[PDB]
Amino acid sequence: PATVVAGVDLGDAVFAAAVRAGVARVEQLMDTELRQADEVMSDSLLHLFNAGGKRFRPLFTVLSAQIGPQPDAAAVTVAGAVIEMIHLATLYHDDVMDEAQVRRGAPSANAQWGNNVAILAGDYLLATASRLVARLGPEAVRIIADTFAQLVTGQMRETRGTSEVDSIEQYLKVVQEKTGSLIGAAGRLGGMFSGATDEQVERLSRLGGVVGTAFQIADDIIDIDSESDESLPGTDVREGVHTLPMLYALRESGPDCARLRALLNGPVDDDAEVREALTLLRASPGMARAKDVLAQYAAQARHELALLPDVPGRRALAALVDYTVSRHG
Amino acid sequence: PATVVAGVDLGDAVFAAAVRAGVARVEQLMDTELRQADELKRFRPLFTVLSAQIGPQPDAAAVTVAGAVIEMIHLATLYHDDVMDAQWGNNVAILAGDYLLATASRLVARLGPEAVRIIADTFAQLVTGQMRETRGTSENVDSIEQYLKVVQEKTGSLIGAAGRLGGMFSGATDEQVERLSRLGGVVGTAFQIADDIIDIDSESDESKLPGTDVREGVHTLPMLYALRESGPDCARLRALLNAEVREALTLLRASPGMARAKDVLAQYAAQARHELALLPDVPGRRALAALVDYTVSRH
Ligand SMILES: [Mg+2]
Ligand SMILES: [Mg+2]
Ligand SMILES: [Mg+2]
């Protein structure tokens, strides 16, 4: 609709084309950078890249930089590419870990080329992003390495808990680490290199981590009560991963919670069990307690973004937060 | 023995001791840095610290940081190749490798953006070597030229970086940094050609199980040379190279292609020693000399 850029309606086509141009420049950079790789990477490298992505983080970086005097600064496009490359790397690695066959509506990188070619593809994304971020200076470099480290402890935290745990507190530490910090960094990078005041930078950075925690939580609710609008439904069920709505549903009481407690104990290979467990979780009070927490996070973000200056980028960010909790995929 | 550090005999028990401290500082930094998330023979550490012997400040903290970053990237690639195509272990391969890259990312961030560009490139080269390898195997194709490119990328490139970073951060001159970098490039190439040669002559008590490259069908230099031969037992080895596999080895070790592979390891040795001769006449150049020899003559 030309007022929508990357799933988000921005109200105006003049403004949306400016943001679209910025998101388009983040993508030209990745397309340039990846395409320059040795012949032997090009299949796996562009696989997830060719097939569409939500483009959420390039948007968030671009929308954050709109809080600045030079939102179109070239260093913002660079920082916009670093963020999305790291995120792409983790999709290659996640899809091998979750043994996922399908990603972004296409064959997942590993279902196409096998686990090792997938792992390496992600590695090469990490190198490329490392090289890109060094262009932005010592502090940008420190930011992205702190964020990448904190991302991985999130992934490790999640894995440690599944192998043993069911702890809301720990889950909230996971989603903040494995998703929030990267968008936290993207907000901090777009504030920085668009020229926003130190305060706005901190405010945009705070905002990205909250938006990132929210976005992951909506992704875990979508995994349970969506039906093939995500990108395969109920993956958390099958992998025995216990996200927020399952965790609450297990703290529940009654015959339903009883069944779930035995179903969600470890992985599920039976298809007709996932259908039953998806029905149970979809109906549980646990799922509505988790929609609440989601809305609570949305409110922390809209509060954070309500103390940003009244500029079009503050409205645009507000629609992004709303999109983040209201979308269905 | 007292004069041996990380497998290389440096002739001098006193120099080997100073080198060991450098290697153990690296080992200790890998310990303090890897310890907590919510709480995994040291050739590349050793190569870093010997490079830095050419510089004025061999013991610089930056040198120790670079040694750790190198070996962490090294290990991360080891974990990642233990991913096979059971999920519990695969997950531990990927994350352990990813936690090592994250921690290297943090450490190199302290070494600064030029040290970030260097490490980023060599990992990209490193990963490229692995793809070439992994994908040269799937096609069953057998070029010496893809294999030589493989080892320069997969193995030679990270030791190149070890010499360059040991060079810069010991305070070596610009010419010396690039010379160390060219050095580690050939040393890592040859080190890998020796690894592949070893896989066919070694035994388990004297190493890993032999012929694991044969089992996976990874065709290394002695193989690629041996497949080009024309003898009575060639076709037998042509077919065998897709526990009977113990018969491919015994064909491989008495092959003239194997001795060809050893000639080339030597030609890489000569190249590395010429790089060495162009360095200052200091004890560290001697130590590097002993490393080059150990690189091409172990088992
Ligand atoms: Mg659009
Ligand atoms: Mg996506
Ligand atoms: Mg709790």
Side-chain angles (χ1 to χ4, degrees), chain B residues 11-66:
Chain B
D12 198 7
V14 153
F15 188 36
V19 177
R20 231 202 315 287
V23 166
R25 272 170 259 146
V26 176
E27 217 171 306
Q28 277 142 32
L29 189 59
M30 326 209 324
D31 252 340
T32 83
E33 288 301 329
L34 285 187
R35 193 185 251 101
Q36 160 143 55
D38 46 298
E39 174 180 340
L40 179 94
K41 307 159 84 27
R42 299 297 185 220
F43 182 81
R44 291 159 192 77
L46 165 62
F47 193 88
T48 293
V49 308
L50 299 176
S51 292
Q53 305 308 300
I54 300 297
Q57 311 125 334
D59 300 299
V63 169
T64 309
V65 181

Short mmCIF file of all heavy atoms in Angstrom, two decimals, chain B residues 11-66:
data_model
loop_
_atom_site.label_atom_id
_atom_site.label_comp_id
_atom_site.label_asym_id
_atom_site.label_seq_id
_atom_site.Cartn_x
_atom_site.Cartn_y
_atom_site.Cartn_z
N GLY B 11 65.27 -26.05 21.38
CA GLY B 11 66.67 -26.22 21.70
C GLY B 11 67.11 -25.68 23.04
O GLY B 11 68.06 -26.21 23.64
N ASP B 12 66.44 -24.65 23.53
CA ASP B 12 66.90 -23.86 24.67
C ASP B 12 65.88 -23.92 25.79
O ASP B 12 64.80 -23.33 25.69
CB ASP B 12 67.11 -22.41 24.23
CG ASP B 12 67.96 -21.65 25.18
OD1 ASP B 12 68.49 -22.28 26.12
OD2 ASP B 12 68.09 -20.42 24.99
N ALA B 13 66.22 -24.62 26.88
CA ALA B 13 65.29 -24.75 27.99
C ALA B 13 64.94 -23.40 28.62
O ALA B 13 63.86 -23.26 29.21
CB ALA B 13 65.88 -25.69 29.04
N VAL B 14 65.82 -22.41 28.51
CA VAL B 14 65.52 -21.10 29.09
C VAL B 14 64.60 -20.31 28.17
O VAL B 14 63.63 -19.68 28.63
CB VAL B 14 66.82 -20.33 29.42
CG1 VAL B 14 66.61 -18.82 29.39
CG2 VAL B 14 67.31 -20.73 30.78
N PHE B 15 64.88 -20.33 26.87
CA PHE B 15 64.00 -19.66 25.92
C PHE B 15 62.64 -20.34 25.87
O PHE B 15 61.61 -19.67 25.85
CB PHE B 15 64.64 -19.65 24.54
CG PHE B 15 63.90 -18.81 23.54
CD1 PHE B 15 63.28 -17.64 23.93
CD2 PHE B 15 63.80 -19.20 22.22
CE1 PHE B 15 62.60 -16.87 23.01
CE2 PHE B 15 63.12 -18.44 21.30
CZ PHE B 15 62.52 -17.27 21.69
N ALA B 16 62.64 -21.68 25.86
CA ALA B 16 61.39 -22.42 25.88
C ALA B 16 60.56 -22.06 27.11
O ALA B 16 59.33 -22.04 27.03
CB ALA B 16 61.67 -23.93 25.84
N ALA B 17 61.21 -21.75 28.23
CA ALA B 17 60.46 -21.35 29.42
C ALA B 17 59.77 -20.00 29.21
O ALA B 17 58.59 -19.85 29.54
CB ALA B 17 61.37 -21.31 30.65
N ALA B 18 60.49 -19.02 28.67
CA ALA B 18 59.85 -17.73 28.39
C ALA B 18 58.71 -17.89 27.40
O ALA B 18 57.65 -17.25 27.53
CB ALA B 18 60.89 -16.73 27.87
N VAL B 19 58.89 -18.74 26.40
CA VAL B 19 57.85 -19.00 25.42
C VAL B 19 56.65 -19.67 26.09
O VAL B 19 55.49 -19.35 25.80
CB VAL B 19 58.43 -19.83 24.26
CG1 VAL B 19 57.39 -20.18 23.24
CG2 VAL B 19 59.56 -19.06 23.60
N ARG B 20 56.91 -20.60 27.02
CA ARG B 20 55.82 -21.30 27.70
C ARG B 20 54.92 -20.32 28.47
O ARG B 20 53.69 -20.38 28.37
CB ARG B 20 56.41 -22.35 28.64
CG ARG B 20 55.81 -23.73 28.48
CD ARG B 20 56.01 -24.56 29.74
NE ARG B 20 57.37 -24.44 30.27
CZ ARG B 20 58.44 -25.00 29.73
NH1 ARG B 20 58.36 -25.77 28.65
NH2 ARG B 20 59.64 -24.80 30.28
N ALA B 21 55.53 -19.43 29.27
CA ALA B 21 54.80 -18.39 29.97
C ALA B 21 53.86 -17.64 29.03
O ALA B 21 52.68 -17.43 29.35
CB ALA B 21 55.79 -17.42 30.63
N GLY B 22 54.37 -17.23 27.87
CA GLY B 22 53.51 -16.61 26.88
C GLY B 22 52.36 -17.50 26.49
O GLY B 22 51.19 -17.09 26.49
N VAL B 23 52.66 -18.77 26.19
CA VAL B 23 51.60 -19.71 25.85
C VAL B 23 50.62 -19.89 27.02
O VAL B 23 49.41 -20.00 26.81
CB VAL B 23 52.22 -21.04 25.39
CG1 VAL B 23 51.16 -22.15 25.36
CG2 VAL B 23 52.88 -20.87 24.01
N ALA B 24 51.13 -19.91 28.26
CA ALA B 24 50.23 -20.13 29.39
C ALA B 24 49.41 -18.88 29.74
O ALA B 24 48.30 -19.00 30.25
CB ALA B 24 51.02 -20.60 30.61
N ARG B 25 49.95 -17.69 29.48
CA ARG B 25 49.12 -16.50 29.59
C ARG B 25 47.93 -16.58 28.64
O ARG B 25 46.79 -16.29 29.01
CB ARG B 25 49.96 -15.26 29.29
CG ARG B 25 50.65 -14.68 30.52
CD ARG B 25 51.64 -13.61 30.12
NE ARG B 25 53.00 -14.14 30.11
CZ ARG B 25 53.96 -13.77 29.27
NH1 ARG B 25 53.74 -12.88 28.32
NH2 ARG B 25 55.18 -14.28 29.41
N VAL B 26 48.18 -17.01 27.40
CA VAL B 26 47.09 -17.25 26.47
C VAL B 26 46.10 -18.25 27.06
O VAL B 26 44.91 -17.95 27.21
CB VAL B 26 47.64 -17.71 25.12
CG1 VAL B 26 46.51 -18.05 24.18
CG2 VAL B 26 48.49 -16.61 24.54
N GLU B 27 46.59 -19.43 27.46
CA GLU B 27 45.72 -20.43 28.08
C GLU B 27 44.93 -19.84 29.25
O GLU B 27 43.77 -20.20 29.46
CB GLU B 27 46.54 -21.63 28.55
CG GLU B 27 45.85 -22.97 28.38
CD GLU B 27 46.77 -24.16 28.65
OE1 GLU B 27 47.86 -24.24 28.03
OE2 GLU B 27 46.40 -25.03 29.50
N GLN B 28 45.53 -18.93 30.03
CA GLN B 28 44.82 -18.41 31.19
C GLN B 28 43.78 -17.38 30.79
O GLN B 28 42.72 -17.30 31.42
CB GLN B 28 45.79 -17.80 32.19
CG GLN B 28 46.42 -18.81 33.11
CD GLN B 28 47.87 -18.48 33.38
OE1 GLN B 28 48.25 -17.30 33.42
NE2 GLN B 28 48.68 -19.52 33.58
N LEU B 29 44.06 -16.59 29.75
CA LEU B 29 43.05 -15.67 29.24
C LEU B 29 41.86 -16.44 28.67
O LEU B 29 40.71 -16.04 28.88
CB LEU B 29 43.68 -14.74 28.21
CG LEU B 29 42.81 -13.59 27.72
CD1 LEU B 29 42.40 -12.69 28.87
CD2 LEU B 29 43.55 -12.80 26.66
N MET B 30 42.11 -17.56 27.97
CA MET B 30 41.00 -18.38 27.48
C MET B 30 40.19 -18.93 28.64
O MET B 30 39.00 -19.23 28.48
CB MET B 30 41.48 -19.55 26.62
CG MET B 30 42.71 -19.31 25.77
SD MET B 30 42.75 -20.29 24.25
CE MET B 30 42.01 -21.81 24.82
N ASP B 31 40.81 -19.06 29.81
CA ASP B 31 40.09 -19.57 30.96
C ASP B 31 39.21 -18.49 31.57
O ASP B 31 38.00 -18.69 31.73
CB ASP B 31 41.07 -20.11 31.99
CG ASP B 31 41.05 -21.60 32.05
OD1 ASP B 31 40.05 -22.17 31.60
OD2 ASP B 31 42.05 -22.20 32.51
N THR B 32 39.79 -17.34 31.92
CA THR B 32 38.99 -16.30 32.57
C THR B 32 37.87 -15.80 31.65
O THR B 32 36.77 -15.49 32.12
CB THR B 32 39.88 -15.13 33.02
OG1 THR B 32 40.11 -14.24 31.93
CG2 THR B 32 41.22 -15.63 33.53
N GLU B 33 38.11 -15.77 30.33
CA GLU B 33 37.12 -15.19 29.42
C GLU B 33 35.99 -16.15 29.09
O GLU B 33 34.86 -15.70 28.84
CB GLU B 33 37.80 -14.74 28.13
CG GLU B 33 38.65 -13.49 28.31
CD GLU B 33 37.85 -12.31 28.83
OE1 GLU B 33 36.63 -12.22 28.53
OE2 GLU B 33 38.44 -11.46 29.54
N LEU B 34 36.24 -17.46 29.09
CA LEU B 34 35.22 -18.43 28.72
C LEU B 34 34.36 -18.88 29.89
O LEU B 34 33.39 -19.62 29.67
CB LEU B 34 35.86 -19.66 28.06
CG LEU B 34 36.37 -19.52 26.63
CD1 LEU B 34 36.79 -20.88 26.09
CD2 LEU B 34 35.33 -18.88 25.71
N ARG B 35 34.66 -18.43 31.12
CA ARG B 35 34.17 -19.09 32.33
C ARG B 35 32.65 -19.04 32.47
O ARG B 35 32.00 -20.07 32.66
CB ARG B 35 34.83 -18.50 33.57
CG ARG B 35 34.61 -19.37 34.79
CD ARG B 35 35.14 -18.74 36.06
NE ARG B 35 36.32 -19.45 36.52
CZ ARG B 35 37.57 -19.03 36.32
NH1 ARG B 35 37.82 -17.88 35.72
NH2 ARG B 35 38.58 -19.79 36.74
N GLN B 36 32.07 -17.84 32.44
CA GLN B 36 30.65 -17.68 32.75
C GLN B 36 29.87 -17.15 31.55
O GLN B 36 30.24 -16.13 30.96
CB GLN B 36 30.44 -16.76 33.96
CG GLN B 36 29.03 -16.18 34.02
CD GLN B 36 28.50 -16.06 35.44
OE1 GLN B 36 29.13 -15.45 36.31
NE2 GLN B 36 27.35 -16.67 35.68
N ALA B 37 28.80 -17.86 31.19
CA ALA B 37 27.66 -17.24 30.54
C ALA B 37 26.53 -17.31 31.55
O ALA B 37 26.35 -16.35 32.34
CB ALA B 37 27.33 -17.93 29.21
N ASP B 38 25.73 -18.38 31.57
CA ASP B 38 24.97 -18.76 32.75
C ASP B 38 25.66 -19.89 33.51
O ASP B 38 25.05 -20.51 34.39
CB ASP B 38 23.54 -19.16 32.39
CG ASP B 38 23.47 -20.09 31.18
OD1 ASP B 38 23.89 -19.66 30.08
OD2 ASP B 38 22.98 -21.24 31.33
N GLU B 39 26.91 -20.18 33.15
CA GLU B 39 27.78 -21.18 33.77
C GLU B 39 27.04 -22.43 34.27
O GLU B 39 27.29 -23.54 33.79
CB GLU B 39 28.56 -20.52 34.90
CG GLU B 39 29.40 -21.47 35.73
CD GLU B 39 30.17 -20.76 36.84
OE1 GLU B 39 30.36 -19.53 36.75
OE2 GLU B 39 30.59 -21.44 37.80
N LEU B 40 35.75 -28.02 26.43
CA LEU B 40 35.90 -26.62 26.04
C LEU B 40 36.95 -25.95 26.92
O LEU B 40 38.15 -26.01 26.62
CB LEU B 40 34.55 -25.86 26.15
CG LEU B 40 34.52 -24.36 25.79
CD1 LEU B 40 34.12 -24.16 24.36
CD2 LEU B 40 33.60 -23.55 26.67
N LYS B 41 47.46 -29.12 22.10
CA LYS B 41 48.90 -28.84 22.15
C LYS B 41 49.28 -27.39 21.82
O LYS B 41 50.46 -27.08 21.79
CB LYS B 41 49.66 -29.78 21.20
CG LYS B 41 49.36 -31.27 21.40
CD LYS B 41 49.71 -32.12 20.15
CE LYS B 41 51.19 -32.56 20.06
NZ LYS B 41 51.90 -32.67 21.38
N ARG B 42 48.31 -26.51 21.52
CA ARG B 42 48.53 -25.06 21.57
C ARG B 42 49.47 -24.54 20.48
O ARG B 42 50.32 -23.67 20.73
CB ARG B 42 49.02 -24.64 22.96
CG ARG B 42 48.00 -24.98 24.05
CD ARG B 42 46.68 -24.19 23.83
NE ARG B 42 45.70 -24.38 24.90
CZ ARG B 42 44.39 -24.53 24.72
NH1 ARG B 42 43.86 -24.50 23.51
NH2 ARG B 42 43.60 -24.69 25.77
N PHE B 43 49.29 -25.02 19.25
CA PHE B 43 50.19 -24.63 18.17
C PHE B 43 50.02 -23.16 17.77
O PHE B 43 51.02 -22.47 17.50
CB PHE B 43 49.97 -25.53 16.96
CG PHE B 43 50.90 -25.23 15.79
CD1 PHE B 43 52.20 -25.72 15.77
CD2 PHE B 43 50.46 -24.46 14.72
CE1 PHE B 43 53.04 -25.47 14.70
CE2 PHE B 43 51.28 -24.20 13.66
CZ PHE B 43 52.58 -24.70 13.64
N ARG B 44 48.78 -22.67 17.71
CA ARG B 44 48.58 -21.29 17.27
C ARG B 44 48.89 -20.27 18.37
O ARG B 44 49.50 -19.23 18.08
CB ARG B 44 47.17 -21.13 16.72
CG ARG B 44 46.99 -21.89 15.43
CD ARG B 44 45.51 -22.15 15.15
NE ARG B 44 45.36 -23.11 14.06
CZ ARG B 44 45.54 -24.42 14.19
NH1 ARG B 44 45.77 -24.98 15.37
NH2 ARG B 44 45.48 -25.19 13.09
N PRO B 45 48.51 -20.52 19.63
CA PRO B 45 49.15 -19.76 20.73
C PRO B 45 50.67 -19.67 20.59
O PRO B 45 51.22 -18.56 20.55
CB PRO B 45 48.73 -20.53 21.97
CG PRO B 45 47.41 -21.08 21.61
CD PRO B 45 47.48 -21.43 20.14
N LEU B 46 51.34 -20.84 20.48
CA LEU B 46 52.80 -20.86 20.37
C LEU B 46 53.30 -20.05 19.17
O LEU B 46 54.26 -19.28 19.29
CB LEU B 46 53.30 -22.30 20.26
CG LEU B 46 54.75 -22.51 19.79
CD1 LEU B 46 55.76 -21.88 20.72
CD2 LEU B 46 55.05 -23.98 19.65
N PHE B 47 52.64 -20.20 18.02
CA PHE B 47 53.03 -19.42 16.85
C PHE B 47 52.84 -17.93 17.09
O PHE B 47 53.65 -17.11 16.63
CB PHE B 47 52.24 -19.85 15.62
CG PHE B 47 52.80 -19.29 14.34
CD1 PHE B 47 53.80 -19.99 13.65
CD2 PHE B 47 52.38 -18.05 13.85
CE1 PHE B 47 54.35 -19.47 12.47
CE2 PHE B 47 52.92 -17.52 12.68
CZ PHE B 47 53.91 -18.23 11.98
N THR B 48 51.77 -17.54 17.78
CA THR B 48 51.61 -16.12 18.09
C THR B 48 52.79 -15.62 18.91
O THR B 48 53.42 -14.62 18.57
CB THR B 48 50.29 -15.86 18.81
OG1 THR B 48 49.21 -16.11 17.91
CG2 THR B 48 50.20 -14.41 19.29
N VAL B 49 53.14 -16.35 19.98
CA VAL B 49 54.12 -15.81 20.91
C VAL B 49 55.51 -15.81 20.29
O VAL B 49 56.33 -14.94 20.62
CB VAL B 49 54.06 -16.58 22.25
CG1 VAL B 49 52.63 -16.62 22.77
CG2 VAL B 49 54.59 -17.98 22.11
N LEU B 50 55.79 -16.72 19.35
CA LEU B 50 57.09 -16.71 18.68
C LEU B 50 57.18 -15.57 17.67
O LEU B 50 58.23 -14.91 17.56
CB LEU B 50 57.35 -18.05 17.97
CG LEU B 50 57.41 -19.35 18.78
CD1 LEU B 50 57.58 -20.55 17.83
CD2 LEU B 50 58.51 -19.31 19.85
N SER B 51 56.11 -15.33 16.92
CA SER B 51 56.07 -14.12 16.10
C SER B 51 56.44 -12.91 16.94
O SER B 51 57.40 -12.19 16.62
CB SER B 51 54.68 -13.96 15.48
OG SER B 51 54.44 -14.99 14.53
N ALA B 52 55.76 -12.71 18.05
CA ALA B 52 55.99 -11.52 18.87
C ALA B 52 57.42 -11.45 19.41
O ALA B 52 57.82 -10.37 19.88
CB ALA B 52 54.97 -11.48 20.00
N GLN B 53 58.20 -12.53 19.34
CA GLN B 53 59.63 -12.45 19.66
C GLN B 53 60.41 -11.57 18.69
O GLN B 53 61.49 -11.08 19.04
CB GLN B 53 60.26 -13.85 19.69
CG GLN B 53 59.55 -14.80 20.62
CD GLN B 53 59.39 -14.21 22.00
OE1 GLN B 53 60.37 -13.88 22.66
NE2 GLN B 53 58.14 -14.08 22.45
N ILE B 54 59.90 -11.37 17.47
CA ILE B 54 60.55 -10.47 16.52
C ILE B 54 60.33 -9.01 16.89
O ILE B 54 61.09 -8.13 16.46
CB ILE B 54 60.02 -10.76 15.10
CG1 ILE B 54 60.32 -12.20 14.69
CG2 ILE B 54 60.61 -9.79 14.08
CD1 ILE B 54 61.80 -12.51 14.60
N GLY B 55 59.30 -8.72 17.69
CA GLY B 55 59.00 -7.36 18.05
C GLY B 55 59.66 -6.95 19.35
O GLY B 55 60.12 -7.79 20.13
N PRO B 56 59.70 -5.65 19.60
CA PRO B 56 60.34 -5.15 20.83
C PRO B 56 59.64 -5.56 22.11
O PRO B 56 60.31 -5.78 23.12
CB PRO B 56 60.31 -3.63 20.65
CG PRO B 56 60.13 -3.42 19.17
CD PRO B 56 59.30 -4.56 18.70
N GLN B 57 58.31 -5.64 22.10
CA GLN B 57 57.60 -5.98 23.32
C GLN B 57 56.92 -7.33 23.14
O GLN B 57 55.70 -7.37 22.98
CB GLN B 57 56.54 -4.93 23.68
CG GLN B 57 57.04 -3.49 23.66
CD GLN B 57 56.19 -2.60 22.76
OE1 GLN B 57 55.56 -3.07 21.80
NE2 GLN B 57 56.18 -1.30 23.06
N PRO B 58 57.68 -8.44 23.19
CA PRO B 58 57.05 -9.75 22.97
C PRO B 58 55.99 -10.08 23.98
O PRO B 58 55.03 -10.79 23.65
CB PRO B 58 58.23 -10.72 23.08
CG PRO B 58 59.42 -9.89 22.88
CD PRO B 58 59.11 -8.57 23.49
N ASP B 59 56.11 -9.58 25.21
CA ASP B 59 55.24 -9.96 26.31
C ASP B 59 54.03 -9.06 26.43
O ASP B 59 53.30 -9.18 27.42
CB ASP B 59 56.03 -9.95 27.61
CG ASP B 59 57.20 -10.92 27.56
OD1 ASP B 59 56.94 -12.13 27.39
OD2 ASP B 59 58.37 -10.47 27.63
N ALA B 60 53.78 -8.19 25.45
CA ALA B 60 52.67 -7.26 25.54
C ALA B 60 51.36 -7.99 25.77
O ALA B 60 51.13 -9.09 25.25
CB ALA B 60 52.57 -6.42 24.27
N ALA B 61 50.49 -7.36 26.56
CA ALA B 61 49.17 -7.91 26.82
C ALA B 61 48.42 -8.14 25.53
O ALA B 61 47.82 -9.20 25.33
CB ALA B 61 48.39 -6.98 27.75
N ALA B 62 48.46 -7.16 24.62
CA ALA B 62 47.86 -7.31 23.30
C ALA B 62 48.29 -8.60 22.60
O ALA B 62 47.48 -9.22 21.90
CB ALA B 62 48.21 -6.10 22.42
N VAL B 63 49.55 -9.01 22.77
CA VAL B 63 49.99 -10.27 22.18
C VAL B 63 49.19 -11.42 22.76
O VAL B 63 48.67 -12.27 22.03
CB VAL B 63 51.50 -10.47 22.38
CG1 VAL B 63 51.93 -11.90 22.01
CG2 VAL B 63 52.27 -9.45 21.58
N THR B 64 49.04 -11.44 24.08
CA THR B 64 48.28 -12.51 24.71
C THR B 64 46.83 -12.51 24.25
O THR B 64 46.26 -13.57 24.00
CB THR B 64 48.36 -12.37 26.23
OG1 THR B 64 49.74 -12.25 26.61
CG2 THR B 64 47.74 -13.59 26.90
N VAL B 65 46.23 -11.33 24.13
CA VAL B 65 44.86 -11.25 23.61
C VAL B 65 44.78 -11.87 22.21
O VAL B 65 43.85 -12.63 21.91
CB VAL B 65 44.38 -9.78 23.60
CG1 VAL B 65 42.96 -9.70 23.08
CG2 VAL B 65 44.54 -9.14 24.99
N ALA B 66 45.75 -11.55 21.34
CA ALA B 66 45.69 -12.05 19.97
C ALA B 66 45.86 -13.56 19.93
O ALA B 66 45.16 -14.25 19.19
CB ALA B 66 46.76 -11.38 19.11
#
